[PDB]
Amino acid sequence: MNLVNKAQLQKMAYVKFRIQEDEYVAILNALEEYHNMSESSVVEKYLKLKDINNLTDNYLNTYKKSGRNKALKKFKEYLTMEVLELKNNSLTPVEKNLHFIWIGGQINDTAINYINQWKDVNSDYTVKVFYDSNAFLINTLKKTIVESATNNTLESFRENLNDPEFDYNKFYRKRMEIIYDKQKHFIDYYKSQIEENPEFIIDNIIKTYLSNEYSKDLEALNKYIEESLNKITANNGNDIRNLEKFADEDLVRLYNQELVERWNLAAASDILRISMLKEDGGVYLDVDMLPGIQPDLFKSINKPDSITNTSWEMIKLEAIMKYKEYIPGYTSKNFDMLDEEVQRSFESALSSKSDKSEIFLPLDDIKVSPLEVKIAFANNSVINQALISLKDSYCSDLVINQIKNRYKILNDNLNPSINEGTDFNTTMKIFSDKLASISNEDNMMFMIKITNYLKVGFAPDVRSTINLSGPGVYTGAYQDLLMFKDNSTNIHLLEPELRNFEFPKTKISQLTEQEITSLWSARAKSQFEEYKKGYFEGA
Ligand SMILES: O=c1ccn([C@@H]2O[C@H](COP(=O)(O)OP(=O)(O)O)[C@@H](O)[C@H]2O)c(=O)[nH]1
Ligand SMILES: O[C@H]1[C@H](O)[C@@H](O)CN2CC[C@H](O)[C@H]12
Ligand SMILES: [Ca+2]
Ligand SMILES: [Ca+2]
Ligand SMILES: [Ca+2]
């Protein structure tokens, strides 16, 4: 898997009596100078491979019938192989920063209890729980608007409950039309306030608006802010509103779009996490992840043949929490179904262990290449719930570029659509038609997945987020990397290629109570039925 010589390339691409074209010399010259760059940095080496790939298909484009072409297509696959070799040979320990994010409301104790597990076992990591001191009321604002929209939609359904098809589908359709109006009424208010007074603070804009439009109590909202601030402060809180240099101005603008306009705290955290990893370096984790387990801990308890690998991983964390009680309240529903004898196998192994680092596996030195961002996998697909990146890595810039290029397309078409539209439905049709008019083979799936952006958080089965700030931006970056592109949207990378970037498996437990619970946000008919029930169950 060493990269072919200039001389070896001449052998592959040989055509008897054929003139050496300028475009072909160019490739050979360039490949020679690559092999002369052993002292160069890995990024520099990667950039040279990249210049070489571009020279190659300049030849392939200029001479489409050439007999060199079969060999030159092979060579391009060899260049891609060479990226992996550089990557595997350029590993170095990440900065020992451990990042979490909680924005738009008060951090729960459940989040704090999981975070502490990582804190206790990683003394040599700096734990930073990122928050936004301007924005403790995002969830309050959203919940208020949504509540108001739900209640209005039920009043329009009051005489049509028992029949025929005033059902969950119609509910969400009509409620969303109301949400849109209420949400745009806020955004317009916020936008005008920010024009008038650009020093103005988000939470202050929000309390004024809730106070005036939704009769909310100023005192109560002020109190909530104080409690939220006090709570994160006592828990390694890092205010993003202190930090100076991290702020790419375009990314900042996307962060506040997601935070203040769209109320999508997941997307805002998607944007924030990669930005902090580029600026700080380290390991990013969602607050629902737990440390890996020491491999040897339960190594001698054989899994009952009937139980799945997934259930068994789940059972192991539950055994830890039953007998050590590190997170109080942690479920034991699965663990309690095992035969008495197996429960005691777990109990005994947990008996002889004194400290938490004999139970959980500390991160210690994690090695990573400047060319990559490591990522967690769930179900054969990447998931950005855990990430690893050196400060200022090449691949962190690929991810950030993907986010910006995607949002650009979203905004350039969505902003005019919002401006021309008397309502949700007219805006949507306008937006969809605009997307249709510029769609092609490469961006068609992306265009399809971002069409329902305005419904994100308010309706079921929406996948816009994944394809703007989530998992899709990572597969796009990895394809950019391997294929020497900067625009990947149509993905041909398979799982085994994507596995080259997986987060070290022993160093994370993804199958926690909170995450499994969060995997259930499948359709909630129940919600439309529970909202329904909350109209006979009162005074
Ligand atoms: O109110 C919220 C909700 C989510 N998040 C961030 O979004 C991450 C992922 O959210 P969640 O696990 O609920 O999303 P899901 O995994 O279901 O896509 C969390 O760890 C937080 O960093 C946040 O800051 N505030
Ligand atoms: O914030 C992330 C979360 O960290 C991951 O589990 C992937 N989720 C998919 C949708 C959104 O991107 C969200
Ligand atoms: Ca009072
Ligand atoms: Ca730093
Ligand atoms: Ca989750």
Structure description:
The chain has helices spanning 6-12, 22-35, 42-62, 69-88, 109-121, 138-155, 168-196, 202-213, 218-233, 249-261, 265-280, 309-324, 340-349, 394-419, 424-438, 444-450, 471-483, 495-498, 513-518, 525-533, and strands spanning 92-93, 97-101, 126-131, 237-239, 282-285, 367-368, 374-378, 381-389. With 539 residues, it is of the alpha/beta class. The protein has three domains: 5-90, Methane Monooxygenase Hydroxylase, Chain G, domain 1 (Up-down Bundle), CATH 1.20.58; 91-292 and 362-539, no CATH class; 293-361, Arc Repressor Mutant, subunit A, CATH 1.10.10.1780. The protein has a six-stranded mixed beta sheet, sandwiched between helices. Helix 1 (6-12) runs antiparallel to helix 2 and helix 10 runs antiparallel to helix 11 (265-280). The chain is globular. It starts with 5 loop residues before the first helix and ends in a 6-residue tail after the last helix. The chain binds uridine-5'-diphosphate, castanospermine and calcium ion (3 copies). The PDB classes it as toxin. The entry lists the keywords toxin, glycosyltransferase.
Structure in a nutshell:
The protein has 539 residues and is α/β, with parallel strands linked by helices. It contains 20 helices and eight strands. Strands 4-3-2-5-8-7 form a six-stranded mixed β-sheet, sandwiched between helices.
